[PDB]
Amino acid sequence: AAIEFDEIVKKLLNIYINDICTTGEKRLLNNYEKSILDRIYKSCEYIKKNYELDFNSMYNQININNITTSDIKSKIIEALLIDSRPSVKLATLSFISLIAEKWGEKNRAKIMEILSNEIVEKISNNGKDFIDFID
């Protein structure tokens, strides 16, 4: 019959349930975890604001068309592979956060499969030192 709103509903339902998932996840964090998570939001926003042009230049490097997710992942992780100070972890995470912000029209999967496995493991390594750095 009238199909002209079908895609809108599908799109808004995915956004809606992904958000409830996050809420469900946050709800089971204890207060210490909630406090660290908050520090992560704030530090990354600070870094994204203060290195905006750096990040824009870096963004244009990986927002080209002739590139796969594995290649983007390789470009981004390269700093950590040789230098894993928490400052670089924060820079790397903040950049990934910027990409997430900018790829709103893409499938969430194409941001999450940048972060997942190797990069998140590399950042999580010595997580205590990372937490100590931002807390």
Partner: peptide, 22 residues
């Protein structure tokens, strides 16, 4: 030798972050 530009810049930002957080 020469990192890809993205990694080169993240390391640059990383150094700068380190300097001010002191």
């Amino acid at each position: 030798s020469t990192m890809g530009q993205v990694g080169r810049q993240l390391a640059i930002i990383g150094d700068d972050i380190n300097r001010r957080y002191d």
